[PDB]
Assembly symmetry: C2
Homo-oligomer: 50 residues x 2
């Protein structure tokens, strides 16, 4: 970045990219799989009961 003041780079980088795209994608992928995991656990519990 065209600047000489110390700390003018980190603040600008945070402003431009508060949350990176990879974190959002990972969060979405992990959140989407939770109903499948809970269904698998419920099926395991049902099998254990019988």
């Amino acid at each position: 970045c065209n600047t000489l003041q110390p700390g003018c780079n980190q603040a600008c980088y945070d402003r431009a990219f508060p949350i990176s795209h990879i974190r959002y994608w990972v969060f979405q992928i992990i959140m989407v799989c939770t109903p499948s995991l809970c269904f698998i656990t419920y099926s395991v519990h049902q099998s254990a009961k019988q």
Copy 2:
């Protein structure tokens, strides 16, 4: 100056101080003394004539 672009310093210095005060003062002092010099030369010529 708070900048990183090369050449951003000389142009700004020229814009802020196109002509320095010392040059103007010297020019004024030299210009003021010219009538005295021409009067002295005219007096010398008059003395030489007589």
